Amino acid sequence: SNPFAHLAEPLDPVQPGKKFFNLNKLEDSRYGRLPFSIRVLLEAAIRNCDEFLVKKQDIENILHWNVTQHKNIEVPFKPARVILQDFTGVPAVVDFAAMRDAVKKLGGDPEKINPVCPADLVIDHSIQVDFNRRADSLQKNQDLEFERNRERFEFLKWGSQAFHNMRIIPPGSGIIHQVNLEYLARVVFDQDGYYYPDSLVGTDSHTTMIDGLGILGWGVGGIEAEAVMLGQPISMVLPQVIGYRLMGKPHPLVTSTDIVLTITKHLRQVGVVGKFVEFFGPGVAQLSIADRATIANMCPEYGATAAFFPVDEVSITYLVQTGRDEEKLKYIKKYLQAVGMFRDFNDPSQDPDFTQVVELDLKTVVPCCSGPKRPQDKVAVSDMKKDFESCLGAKQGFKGFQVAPEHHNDHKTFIYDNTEFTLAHGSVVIAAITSCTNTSNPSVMLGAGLLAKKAVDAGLNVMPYIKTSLSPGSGVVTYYLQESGVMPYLSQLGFDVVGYGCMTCIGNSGPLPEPVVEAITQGDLVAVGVLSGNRNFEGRVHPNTRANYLASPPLVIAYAIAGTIRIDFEKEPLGVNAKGQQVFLKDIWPTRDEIQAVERQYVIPGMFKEVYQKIETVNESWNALATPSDKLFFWNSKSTYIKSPPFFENLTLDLQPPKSIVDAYVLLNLGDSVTTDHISPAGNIARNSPAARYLTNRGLTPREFNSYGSRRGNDAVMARGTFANIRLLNRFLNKQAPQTIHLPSGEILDVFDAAERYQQAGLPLIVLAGKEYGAGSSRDWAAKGPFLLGIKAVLAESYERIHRSNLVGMGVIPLEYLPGENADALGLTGQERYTIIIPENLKPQMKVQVKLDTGKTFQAVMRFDTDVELTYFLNGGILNYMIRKMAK
Ligand code: SF4
């Protein structure tokens, strides 16, 4: 039974059948000092205590957090639900279908492969900015989306019928996280007579955006989410919690976006990988839910697992504003208050006992952007011109473009729409109001509109060759931009709505005008994209922009109007007004107070009701998609999108022990901050690549390639796409190239081709890497890929959280250098042959010996961090383990 059953009591004696586990009846003073993020873990353990998956000791360990956070203690966590998008959602449903095949093969019941919690999937990663700056651009983009992705859509739609508990939010509805915040989020569950906190994992690294609403959620690989949907607890080392104390007031010109870029930079410096961050202090109460969500969104960019803002009265106000049901609201606040999970940030006596506290005085926040090449590279708006011009001549890097000083004032004329324009270094060519990060925030969306109106009335324009776009994460945005009268002015500046999906945020940015591309390449220009996103890594916004700056939506507009980031907005006007002459940014910038009025006036629950009323059913094209009635997927050999994966080939019920990796070759020698984009690119498929050759062989032209993310249900493409990022910096080649050296022959080959040779010869492979290996996107293809290339281990200085978990899930060993040790320090070339000794008895975090064919030996930490992770390793993977459990 549940040992804590006595804690269950009615919330309200008027409705005696609706109960909750009352953590206050624990009568334990440790509870009242817990970070509110830890209280969520505690509750989930108590309600789920069976003495099997979740044990009474587990509850004590979580309660004893203040002590046990230092004792490397694993705990279970069963979240309330799972959220997915289509890029990671396709391979997830392929995994499920493949697991059903495997379970049937072994004589099990394939209906056991079925989500036992709610799964919501939002289709947002497929639409691209094929067209912009026109009224019909949205329809034209929506049409191409469906035309390009029909098979994937029919497949997801079948998935939503063939597996229990799956709701799909169709194309043209907005973006996962914004839809989560405005519609999908429960805050408090009311299931089978028990209230409990909403919590989740999502197959997207920015799932942490939900934490702004006091919902404990974070990103995970699909394989981890798959296990969770099947009832497997998350296994984690009980985390330390950094208290981020906010104080002061932001200046009225400062935006949510300025604040998050400031905090991102701040927390990467601090180092919070493997930890929760939990916000508190007098400064939190002034932040709206949208503001808190902006900050929480960027959790993976600063490294943490969670960035938590507990539920307070501001959260409740957001729920009433977004039109949540009256009945539900009643028990959300009432439940949180009764259980001790309801916050008042204005009461220091209620502040938890965090591991340590770090501080931000919001008055120190200045208007800012981040770039040109990393989310943590904060640049004051006041210093944008200076910093870029410094970048022009600096050695090629995150803060260098390496342009000879003589050319810093280069410019190229070009003709666009029979008018001559001049492009130069720092010219803005992409200006996209994009990303759930910011479009969920009416302060910056209306800010952007009010700036647009001011500018238009002031007689300002955006040059017509500039690829401006507006890509909202829900239709509520457009609705209030129209009601408020600001949308026509956005339209005139070139910010018509182009789609309701990720779009430019994810690199789905579409073509630049031919004459603009010409000038850029012919002139050797550093052309600039400015976007309200959370990621700006070289090449991931557009192939032709060497500089990308994250900035608030109104700044996106400001740089569009100015047409360059090499501008001192204080010193230089934007243009000349036909009457009062000089028009400066200051004159057109809306104040916090002018924004708050329009927001208070135009963002009412009725709009949310209206937008979301028909969300699941309105898409006639979706509704039209025919699906088979099958429960077991009819794999089609003709498909280039959907393919039965080899993962479970010849799977046996019984386990055989792990053997050492013997005389492994190093497939790639990598450096620092290798992103999952480098490991498993998701955008354009290059004409000179293994994946292009495969698709060509199958009779497709480049225009039919689609993106890598779109091909994730086809392991044949995805293996070929592994380490195929054209900006991979393999230290074997000392240059950017998606290649490596096949050492036996000395030949330089595309990475997949080189791996084939090694695999044909029966040779094991490893990867050497530096710090922060696997940063960024949650994509488990950055683990499945290497697994299919024959990679048995990685040896790195440090790992990012989601990536490490995906490696473990695929049975690949994540090895870590000992402190003060790395490739240079050990004198490794990567051209040696590597023996990793696996002992008969394994322990989490154990050190193993690595032996080289040269005689050199050293030690590495084996980063299986919990007993459960070790069982995954012994099983050859997390889904292997789950098939075995379900087959018997
Ligand atoms: S790619 Fe951008 S818009 Fe899409 S879910 Fe991620 S953060 Fe949001």
UniProtKB/Swiss-Prot annotation:
Pfam family membership, one: Aconitase_C
Entry binding sites for [4Fe-4S] cluster: 436, 502, 505
EC top class named in words: lyase
Keyword Repeat: no
Effect caused by changing residue 535 to Q: Strongly reduced RNA binding
Gene3D superfamilies linked to this entry: 6.10.190.10, Aconitase, domain 3, Aconitase, domain 4
Cystine pairs: none
Example GO molecular function: aconitate hydratase activity
InterPro entries, A to Z: AcnA_IRP_Swivel, Acnase/IPM_dHydase_lsu_aba_1/3, Acoase/IPM_deHydtase_lsu_aba, Aconitase/3IPM_dehydase_swvl, Aconitase/IRP2, Aconitase_4Fe-4S_BS, Aconitase_4Fe-4S_dom, AconitaseA/IPMdHydase_ssu_swvl
Catalysed reactions, as listed in the record: citrate = D-threo-isocitrate
EC numbers for this chain: 4.2.1.3
GO CC annotation: cytoplasm; cytosol; endoplasmic reticulum; extracellular exosome; Golgi apparatus; mitochondrion
Cellular compartment(s): Cytoplasm, Cytosol
Modified residues (Phosphothreonine): 627
Entry's Gene Ontology BP terms: citrate metabolic process; intestinal absorption; intracellular iron ion homeostasis; NADPH regeneration; post-embryonic development; response to iron(II) ion; tricarboxylic acid cycle
Cofactor: [4Fe-4S] cluster
Function summary: Bifunctional iron sensor that switches between 2 activities depending on iron availability. Iron deprivation, promotes its mRNA binding activity through which it regulates the expression of genes involved in iron uptake, sequestration and utilization. Binds to iron-responsive elements (IRES) in the untranslated region of target mRNAs preventing for instance the translation of ferritin and aminolevulinic acid synthase and stabilizing the transferrin receptor mRNA.
Record note on quaternary structure: Interacts (when associated with the 4Fe-4S) with FBXL5. Interacts with frataxin(81-210).
Family listed: Belongs to the aconitase/IPM isomerase family.
Name of the protein this chain belongs to: Cytoplasmic aconitate hydratase
Protein species of origin: Homo sapiens
